[PDB]
Amino acid sequence: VKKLINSQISLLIGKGLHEFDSLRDPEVNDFRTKMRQFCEEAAAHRQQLGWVEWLQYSFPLQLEPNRALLVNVKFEGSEESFTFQVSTKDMPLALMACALRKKATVFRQQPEEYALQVNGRHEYLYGNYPLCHFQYICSCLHSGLTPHLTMVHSSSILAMRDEQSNLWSLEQPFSIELIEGRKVNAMKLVVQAGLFHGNEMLCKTVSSSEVNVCSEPVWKQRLEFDISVCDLPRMARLCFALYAVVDCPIAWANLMLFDYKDQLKTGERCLYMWPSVLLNPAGTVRGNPNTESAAALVIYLPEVAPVYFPALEKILELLREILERELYEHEKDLVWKMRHEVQEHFPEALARLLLVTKWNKHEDVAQMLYLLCSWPELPVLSALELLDFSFPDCYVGSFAIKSLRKLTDDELFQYLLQLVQVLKYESYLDCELTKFLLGRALANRKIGHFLFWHLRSEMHVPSVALRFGLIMEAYCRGSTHHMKVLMKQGEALSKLKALNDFVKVSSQKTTKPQTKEMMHMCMRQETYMEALSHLQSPLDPSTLLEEVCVEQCTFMDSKMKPLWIMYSSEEAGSAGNVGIIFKNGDDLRQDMLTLQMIQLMDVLWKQEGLDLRMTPYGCLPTGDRTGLIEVVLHSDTIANIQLNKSNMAATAAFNKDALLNWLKSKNPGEALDRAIEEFTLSCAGYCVATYVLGIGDRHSDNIMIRESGQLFHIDFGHFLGNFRVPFILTYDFVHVIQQGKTNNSEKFERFRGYCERAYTILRRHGLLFLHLFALMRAAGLPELSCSKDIQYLKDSLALGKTEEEALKHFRVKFNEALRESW
Ligand SMILES: CC(C)n1nc(C#Cc2cccc(O)c2)c2c(N)ncnc21
């Protein structure tokens, strides 16, 4: 059985556990040891949780950032239900007392024993919050549906919990021996090295002699460095580039100069190199695993007598403000002199001072650290900054995790994406960020859910395979039940990948009706119906994907021929009628990120009382150029609506009418105004989000509308202006805002306000978006690479100007956009 588990993990994580031993690497060993233990202690705790505490682990609350409503409640072991009238202000408990009072009458005769389930979902309503505060009641009110819930008893939830059981001496210059290499090229070879502490180098770089592009090369030279050894900061990273010349790059490689156990390194090292596009401090510090086909440099670290980085005990012994909101040489000096007054009077300026400290003078690091040890904790926003590669020092990083523990789960969920990329910044395997992420992930099943997919989705990337594999194993050890649930998911994705391949081939030999019919047959096979049914949606674990409606599944006509898969649930009703789209052949990362940034805007907007009726649909990469998109139902592209067909509700005299005629046929009588309002509001959000993010190549095929009026965008392969992308106002939306009328500045100008509010709200959190993109640089995304891309955001938010100017500027942009509307 111990064998079984091991083998299911191997299958889950897409790499086999045997490959971890094979390496004969004790760092991997220790990581595997320490992390298993830690994780197992987390599951121990979980099986003693109170029933309510268990619910908070497994089904965390889905909350919003007087008036009457109708609710259906029912009990578990019965089909009989009651419909109570209540107030949106009422707590869940009030409902639960109704229900039981009704039960005790029809059945002829204790609220807190209970939680309410959303029917057909992994979703529960509990806590002291007005019904209307829950996303589910909230949502129910817009669409006009009546919430449906089930009284679940404490014994029934405990039954669930149950089921789920498992030093200063050395003053001479630093040097290595460059010895030999083993690749091929066209013309002379040369090497280049520099000692880096993150971005900043710690001395001028040095070089090789010229060696003809021959071998198999052999240098046997001490490369000597412009820095004394006793100065090397703890996170000294030594970086090599190998290229050729008469500039043509070939390979790079980095290593940490101390091992993971603080011991400085000697003697000889063989270096398996990574392929080129010249010196790459940001690259990983682990060798290329394709040792067969890769160039391997050999070097010799010269045993300097063991030696350890000194323990913290030892380190403990050993016109200001105007600039303080990129500073000159002297400006830096003042800051450093004032460092105690910075700690005492401006603790939030920690970062600007870290960047002034002299990472290549050991004495100064010792003093900086000495301050950091009594530095007050910082706001979440400031902590997010300290995580950047600009702050390699492990003592700073630890302080940043410390400051970040106060992240709520919802906040944590919000920035999870970037915290995983940051892992790519880590120099060793056992690190503060990992324990944190795994700890928080073992405390919340939703966090656990997404950490795992973020990790699984990158197992094809050689530079991260081992790091991520090791983490997913650890999670598994501390959550056997959840591992079974995710295999269920991966098994489904496995089938879609085979089904999607069939469809690509098929669709090149035959007609779309013919191919759809074969898909349906292939899906009807026992192995498929079994693998595609009765799972949690990898896009949102609280969504249950029950029986797949084969007759309703099909495929899109785009290049990669993505799949459209529908699902139903008798137990959830019309709420269990959800759909997912499988796509294989494209990078979904960029789209995912884009979608997370919109969702965040909507959060920030909502927090200031502005609801722009956004449609933040799920989009989740799962594997190599594979992942999942959420089906938004009851929607159609602008392009389709505008085909202006015959024998349709919507055919007018003028192509400009069609889209409004469409809103009309979906919304009879009085209800047309609501839809125009939902259209106007969402239209403003998308105009701002696309403008702020530099998204372009909007056109009527990749914009959609829901029957409610809500407009939203799909298919984002381009942001940050990577084809200055102008703000866009499309004439036919403008026509819808203006309720069909030629002139209507009352409706058109309310629309401008929506835009200006939305825009100015995001400037207030400009720095949260700058920090988040700074951390996304670790993703390797082609369109998020250098400083020019972040500048793009600097300029779109006018984050350097006062709010008078930015708003004035924005107003010129919007006007310009109007000119372009006919
Ligand atoms: C109607 C078609 C065009 N369509 N396409 C939809 C879609 C997509 C998508 C989103 C981001 C990236 C990407 O490549 C594709 C879609 C959806 N999500 N919900 C409802 N209908 C949808």
Task: Look at residue 628 and give its three-state secondary structure.
Answer: strand
| CB of residue 712 inside a 6 A radius of ligand 1 | no
Q: Give the H/E segment covering residue 630.
A: strand 626-630
Distance 119 CA to ligand 1 centre (A): 27
| CB of residue 598 inside a 6 A radius of ligand 1 | no
* Ligand 1, atom 3: closest residue by C-alpha: 637
Q: Cα dihedral sign for 329, 331, 335, 338?
A: positive
Residues 663 and 776 in one domain: yes
CA of residue 174 relative to chain centroid, distance: 40
Distance 52 CA to ligand 1 centre (A): 38
Cα 514 to Cα 275, 503, 529, 581, distances in angstroms: 45, 11, 20, 20
Residues 174 and 87 in one domain: no
- By DSSP bridging, strand 626-630 and strand 619-623 are antiparallel
* CA-wise closest residue to 269 among 302, 299, 292: 299
User: CB–CB of 254/281 below 8 Å?
Assistant: yes
Show Cβ contacts of residue 679 under 8 Å, excluding neighbours closer than 6 positions.
663, 705, 709, 710, 711, 733, 736, 737
| CB of residue 221 inside a 6 A radius of ligand 1 | no
Distance 706 CA to ligand 1 centre (A): 12
Alpha-carbon distance of 634 to 774, in angstroms, equals 37
Distance 766 CA to ligand 1 centre (A): 29
Beta bridge partners of 225: 174
Alpha-carbon distance of 36 to 474, in angstroms, equals 5
Q: What are phi and psi of 547, to 5 degrees?
A: -90, 120
Distance 702 CA to ligand 1 centre (A): 8
Alpha-carbon distance of 700 to 717, in angstroms, equals 16
* CA-wise closest residue to 790 among 685, 691, 693: 693
User: CB–CB of 390/778 below 8 Å?
Assistant: no
Number of H helices, E strands in the chain: 30, 26
Alpha-carbon distance of 747 to 345, in angstroms, equals 50
For residues 122-159, one letter each, b for 16 or more C-beta atoms within 10 angstroms of the residue's C-beta and e for the rest, the string is: bbbbbbeebbbbbebbbebbeeeeebbbbbbbbebbee
User: CB–CB of 537/494 below 8 Å?
Assistant: no
The residue type at 736: V
Show Cβ contacts of residue 789 under 8 Å, excluding neighbours closer than 6 positions.
720, 722, 773, 783
Alpha-carbon distance of 469 to 14, in angstroms, equals 8
* CA-wise closest residue to 365 among 232, 251, 267: 232
Distance 631 CA to ligand 1 centre (A): 7
How is residue 511 written in tokens?
Answer: 């007609």
**Sheet containing 635-637: which strands, arranged edge to edge?**
635-637, 703-706, 711-713
Alpha-carbon distance of 494 to 528, in angstroms, equals 10
Alpha-carbon distance of 52 to 203, in angstroms, equals 57
Q: What is the CATH number of the domain that holds 681?
A: 1.10.1070.11
For residues 557-571, one letter each, b for 16 or more C-beta atoms within 10 angstroms of the residue's C-beta and e for the rest, the string is: eeebbbbebbbbbee
Alpha-carbon distance of 295 to 251, in angstroms, equals 8
* CA-wise closest residue to 325 among 358, 344, 355, 352: 352
Show Cβ contacts of residue 248 under 8 Å, excluding neighbours closer than 6 positions.
185, 186
Q: Cα dihedral sign for 306, 307, 311, 314?
A: positive
Domain boundary, last residue among 145, 166, 187: 166
Alpha-carbon distance of 468 to 458, in angstroms, equals 8
Residues 220 and 238 in one domain: yes
* Ligand 1, atom 18: closest residue by C-alpha: 631
Show Cβ contacts of residue 815 under 8 Å, excluding neighbours closer than 6 positions.
none
In this structure, how many other beta carbons lie within 10 angstroms of the beta carbon of residue 492? 24
| Cα 645-646-652 angle, rounded to 5 deg | 75
In this structure, how many other beta carbons lie within 10 angstroms of the beta carbon of residue 505? 11
| CB of residue 632 inside a 6 A radius of ligand 1 | yes
Task: Look at residue 606 and give its three-state secondary structure.
Answer: helix
Q: Give the H/E segment covering residue 225.
A: strand 218-228
Residues 55 and 138 in one domain: yes
Alpha-carbon distance of 764 to 77, in angstroms, equals 51
Task: Look at residue 616 and give its three-state secondary structure.
Answer: coil
| CB of residue 560 inside a 6 A radius of ligand 1 | no
Distance 252 CA to ligand 1 centre (A): 40
User: CB–CB of 433/426 below 8 Å?
Assistant: yes
Show Cβ contacts of residue 209 under 8 Å, excluding neighbours closer than 6 positions.
190, 219, 221
Residues 386 and 530 in one domain: no
Alpha-carbon distance of 474 to 430, in angstroms, equals 12
User: CB–CB of 360/229 below 8 Å?
Assistant: no
Residues 13 and 84 in one domain: no
Task: Look at residue 429 and give its three-state secondary structure.
Answer: coil
Cis before residue 216, ω within 30 degrees of 0? yes
Alpha-carbon distance of 580 to 553, in angstroms, equals 10
Show Cβ contacts of residue 500 under 8 Å, excluding neighbours closer than 6 positions.
555, 560, 561, 562, 563, 582, 583, 584
In this structure, how many other beta carbons lie within 10 angstroms of the beta carbon of residue 788? 10
Q: What is the CATH number of the domain that holds 473?
A: 1.25.40.70
| CB of residue 635 inside a 6 A radius of ligand 1 | yes
* Ligand 1, atom 14: closest residue by C-alpha: 715
Distance 679 CA to ligand 1 centre (A): 19
Alpha-carbon distance of 792 to 720, in angstroms, equals 6
Beta bridge partners of 240: 193, 253
Residues 568 and 627 in one domain: yes
For residues 402-436, one letter each, b for 16 or more C-beta atoms within 10 angstroms of the residue's C-beta and e for the rest, the string is: ebbeebeeeebbbbbbbbbbbbbbbbbbbbbbbbb
In this structure, how many other beta carbons lie within 10 angstroms of the beta carbon of residue 693? 24
Resolution number, Å: 2.6
In this structure, how many other beta carbons lie within 10 angstroms of the beta carbon of residue 657? 17
Total of domains in the chain: 5
| CB of residue 582 inside a 6 A radius of ligand 1 | no
Distance 245 CA to ligand 1 centre (A): 48
How is residue 461 written in tokens?
Answer: 């990337």
CA of residue 628 relative to chain centroid, distance: 14
CA of residue 646 relative to chain centroid, distance: 44
Helix pair angle (26-46, 432-443), 10° resolution: 30
The residue type at 620: L
Show Cβ contacts of residue 347 under 8 Å, excluding neighbours closer than 6 positions.
375, 376, 378
| CB of residue 459 inside a 6 A radius of ligand 1 | no
The residue type at 182: R
One DSSP character per residue, 689-741 reads: HHHHHT-----TTSEEEETTS-EEE------TT---PPP---HHHHHHHTTT-
CA-CA-CA-CA torsion for 493, 495, 501, 506, nearest 10 degrees?
-140
Give the up-direction half-sphere exposure of residue 781: CA atoms within 13 A in the CB hemisphere. Answer: 25
| CB of residue 40 inside a 6 A radius of ligand 1 | no
Residues 318 and 421 in one domain: yes
Alpha-carbon distance of 272 to 268, in angstroms, equals 13
The ligand 1 atom nearest the CA atom of 595 = 11
End-to-end CA, the chain:
70
Q: To test ligand 1's pocket by mutation, which of 587, 593, 704 has the most ligand atoms within 8 angstroms of CB?
A: 704
Domain boundary, last residue among 631, 660, 685: 631
Distance 722 CA to ligand 1 centre (A): 22
Burial of 629 from C-beta contacts in 10 A (0-12 / 13-18 / 19+): buried
* CA-wise closest residue to 192 among 252, 144, 129: 252
Residues 359 and 423 in one domain: yes
Q: What are phi and psi of 513, to 5 degrees?
A: -60, -45
Alpha-carbon distance of 193 to 457, in angstroms, equals 33
Alpha-carbon distance of 89 to 626, in angstroms, equals 43
The residue type at 799: L
| CB of residue 458 inside a 6 A radius of ligand 1 | no
* CA-wise closest residue to 97 among 81, 78, 84: 84
Alpha-carbon distance of 14 to 493, in angstroms, equals 13
CA of residue 775 relative to chain centroid, distance: 11
How is residue 515 written in tokens?
Answer: 């191919």
* Ligand 1, atom 12: closest residue by C-alpha: 715
Task: Look at residue 744 and give its three-state secondary structure.
Answer: coil
In this structure, how many other beta carbons lie within 10 angstroms of the beta carbon of residue 690? 21
Residues 816 and 672 in one domain: yes
User: CB–CB of 564/554 below 8 Å?
Assistant: yes
* CA-wise closest residue to 564 among 577, 551, 582, 548: 582
> What sections of 168-250 are H helices per DSSP?
none
Q: To test ligand 1's pocket by mutation, which of 629, 633, 718 has the most ligand atoms within 8 angstroms of CB?
A: 629
In this structure, how many other beta carbons lie within 10 angstroms of the beta carbon of residue 52? 15
| CB of residue 637 inside a 6 A radius of ligand 1 | yes
Q: Give the H/E segment covering residue 770.
A: helix 766-776
> What sections of 355-479 are H helices per DSSP?
362-372, 380-386, 394-404, 409-423, 432-443, 445-456, 465-477
Experimental technique used to determine this entry: X-ray
For residues 608-627, one letter each, b for 16 or more C-beta atoms within 10 angstroms of the residue's C-beta and e for the rest, the string is: eebebbbbebbbbbbbbbbb
Domain boundary, last residue among 424, 444, 479: 479
Residue holding tokens 């309703």?
552
Alpha-carbon distance of 746 to 743, in angstroms, equals 9
Alpha-carbon distance of 86 to 89, in angstroms, equals 8
Distance 630 CA to ligand 1 centre (A): 8
User: CB–CB of 142/678 below 8 Å?
Assistant: no
The length of the chain, given as a count of residues: 822
* CA-wise closest residue to 363 among 233, 259, 255, 252: 233
The ligand 1 atom nearest the CA atom of 714 = 10
Task: Print the domain residue range for 53.
Answer: 48-166
CA-CA-CA-CA torsion for 143, 144, 147, 148, nearest 10 degrees?
-90
| CB of residue 617 inside a 6 A radius of ligand 1 | yes
Burial of 10 from C-beta contacts in 10 A (0-12 / 13-18 / 19+): middle
Q: What is the CATH number of the domain that holds 262?
A: 2.60.40.150
Q: Where are the beta strands (DSSP E) in 37-138?
A: 68-75, 81-87, 114-118, 124-125
Q: Helix, strand, coil proportions of the chain in percent (round to 5)?
A: 45, 20, 35
Alpha-carbon distance of 766 to 669, in angstroms, equals 42
Cα 696 to Cα 222, 714, 718, 723, 726, distances in angstroms: 52, 12, 6, 7, 9
Helix pair angle (480-506, 445-456), 10° resolution: 40
Cα 235 to Cα 170, 171, 238, 249, 318, distances in angstroms: 17, 18, 10, 26, 19
Show Cβ contacts of residue 465 under 8 Å, excluding neighbours closer than 6 positions.
15, 289, 458, 459
| CB of residue 540 inside a 6 A radius of ligand 1 | no
Alpha-carbon distance of 515 to 506, in angstroms, equals 6
| CB of residue 591 inside a 6 A radius of ligand 1 | yes
Show Cβ contacts of residue 353 under 8 Å, excluding neighbours closer than 6 positions.
335, 336, 339, 342, 368
One DSSP character per residue, 473-519 reads: HHHHHT-HHHHHHHHHHHHHHHHHHHHHHHHHHHTTTS-HHHHHHHH
How is residue 165 written in tokens?
Answer: 């059981």
The 3-state secondary structure of 13-42, one letter per residue: HCCCCHHHHCCCCHHHHHHHHHHHHHHHHH
Residues 572 and 695 in one domain: no
How is residue 810 written in tokens?
Answer: 């924005």
Alpha-carbon distance of 317 to 79, in angstroms, equals 72
Show Cβ contacts of residue 791 under 8 Å, excluding neighbours closer than 6 positions.
none
* CA-wise closest residue to 151 among 242, 71, 270: 71
Cα 342 to Cα 219, 321, 349, 384, distances in angstroms: 49, 10, 7, 20
Q: Give the H/E segment covering residue 53.
A: helix 51-58
Show Cβ contacts of residue 106 under 8 Å, excluding neighbours closer than 6 positions.
80, 82
Residue holding tokens 């001490």?
222
| CB of residue 657 inside a 6 A radius of ligand 1 | no
* CA-wise closest residue to 12 among 628, 443, 459, 441: 459
The 3-state secondary structure of 256-302, one letter per residue: ECECCCCEECCEEEEEECEECCCCCCCCCCCCCCCCCCCCEEEEEEC
Alpha-carbon distance of 237 to 230, in angstroms, equals 15
How is residue 600 written in tokens?
Answer: 């965040």
* Ligand 1, atom 11: closest residue by C-alpha: 715
| CB of residue 707 inside a 6 A radius of ligand 1 | no
Distance 171 CA to ligand 1 centre (A): 63
Q: What are phi and psi of 412, to 5 degrees?
A: -50, -50
Q: To test ligand 1's pocket by mutation, which of 580, 581, 584, 633 has the most ligand atoms within 8 angstroms of CB?
A: 581
Alpha-carbon distance of 608 to 675, in angstroms, equals 23
Q: What is the CATH number of the domain that holds 509?
A: 3.30.1010.10
Give the CA radius of gyration of the chain. 30
Distance 715 CA to ligand 1 centre (A): 7
Task: Look at residue 126 and give its three-state secondary structure.
Answer: coil
Residues 657 and 756 in one domain: yes
Q: To test ligand 1's pocket by mutation, which of 583, 586, 712, 714 has the most ligand atoms within 8 angstroms of CB?
A: 714
How is residue 696 written in tokens?
Answer: 């372009």
